[PDB]
Symmetry: D2
Subunit: 109 residues, 4 copies
């Protein structure tokens, strides 16, 4: 190639995997994944949880694995790549919707 496009996530499945098949027997799976980090309340010192949400897509073998083993709550590790579909704002500002294309996946439960 010439560029690097790489995401590493650890988080939980927000719902049970949704598995489907292309009209020619290809596995496709879509999951929602929540990753968390902590935040310190400045006033009170309370350690509070912050959550980001990500859409992940798996293909073929990996998608089969996902639907075979993973359920809501499942904690997994993931490497993948960002894929974005260009936008346009109410104010005409270019925006970016992002799915993660998964190439690796390690189960952690």
């Amino acid at each position: 190639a010439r560029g690097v496009n790489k995401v590493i996530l650890i988080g939980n499945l927000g719902q049970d995997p949704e598995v489907r098949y292309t009209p020619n027997g290809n596995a496709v799976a879509n999951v929602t994944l929540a990753t968390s980090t902590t935040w310190r309340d400045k006033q009170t010192g309370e350690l509070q949880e912050r959550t980001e949400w990500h859409r992940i897509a798996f293909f073929n073998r990996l998608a089969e694995i996902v639907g075979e083993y993973l359920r809501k709550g499942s904690k997994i590790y993931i490497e993948g790549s960002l894929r974005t579909r260009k936008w346009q704002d109410k104010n005409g500002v270019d925006r970016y919707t992002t799915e993660i294309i998964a190439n690796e996946m390690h189960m952690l439960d």
Copy 2:
């Protein structure tokens, strides 16, 4: 010490010269658009063709300052950061995720 891991690593070029602003308190804030390339093989003809993804990146404070001063359209950079997503609601009522990369690190690659 968080329960999760949210890491992006990118290498690519600025589509445009950086956009920079300051907050009412002075602190800097920069955004750029990054193109990252890979290569696709045309299965029929064997042609080596370039595919491009586009990314919105936000920088803050000192990093933003560095970006304003040093970067330009075409600049090749390395980026470590985190994904920040604001949630959607689709035409067909499906959930979508609009993401910005929040940069923690930046190395210029000439």
Copy 3:
């Protein structure tokens, strides 16, 4: 100018000992095991290879590790590679490569 990153997930080989440096700082040296399993694409079959990594935790991270982690604990690590030079008893330069941990997350 340069990137030196290591990401690992695997299990501790021992209960960690927090020690102190000749400068008074906490250190915890541990080993971590990562494994690759694959089937030989012809002759042999189910192959499994294990790698042992040397990890150095310093200061608070050292103390956390000393306090929470135990042998076999499943842990996640980000860090940097450092090789150091020492001498054997006959004065020959020998080398050891270690992961200087930046971050760690408990997966258990």
Copy 4:
């Protein structure tokens, strides 16, 4: 099970050189320099097959590249048959930054 991953960006210490293992395969062992505000770290990296050929063709001393790989420590004996150990990076992917 387990993640063993390395990412580097730095420069080759020497013009790379394709050689061959006793199995016949291609391989280039090179060193890569990475630095921090200043201390320089030297990594042994190993490319095999295709990557090795590609590395041997296009890279010279001081070539800035990007690498992903896995860590591997192999065991060997010195003259006196004492177990010694070397940590090398087995590269999966490589990109030229020049």
